[PDB]
């Protein structure tokens, strides 16, 4: 029982990690666009 | 022993994940505010 709960927890945590990676990539693109905008201005 | 260490590791990792989510949310709000500022300017 303890083992299956741990496996399920890691599975869900990997989904969480994947969402945080998505977020970070979005933010990186957006800050880069702002930096370039200001440079181009 | 191996099992309790793994459970404790996941527990701590979930705390880490929660901190990264906090950070990403903060950053998203801040970049959005900057984007809107520049648009309003």
């Amino acid at each position: 029982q303890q083992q299956n709960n741990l496996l399920r927890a890691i599975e869900a945590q990997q989904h969480l990690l994947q969402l945080t990676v998505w977020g970070i990539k979005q933010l990186q693109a957006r800050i880069l666009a702002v930096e370039r905008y200001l440079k181009d201005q | 022993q191996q099992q309790n260490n793994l459970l404790r590791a996941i527990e701590a990792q979930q705390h880490l994940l929660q901190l990264t989510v906090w950070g990403i949310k903060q950053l998203q709000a801040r970049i959005l505010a900057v984007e809107r500022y520049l648009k309003d300017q």
């Binding site: 029982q1 741990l6 869900a12 945590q13 969480l16 998505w22 | 996941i10 979930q14 998203q28």
Partner: peptide
Amino acid sequence: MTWMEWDREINNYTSLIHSLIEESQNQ
């Protein structure tokens, strides 16, 4: 994917993990 959906899914997975970890605290 949107930020509103991002927040929803984050919350879903977090609550599931909490339940799983607790349910294991009761080894």
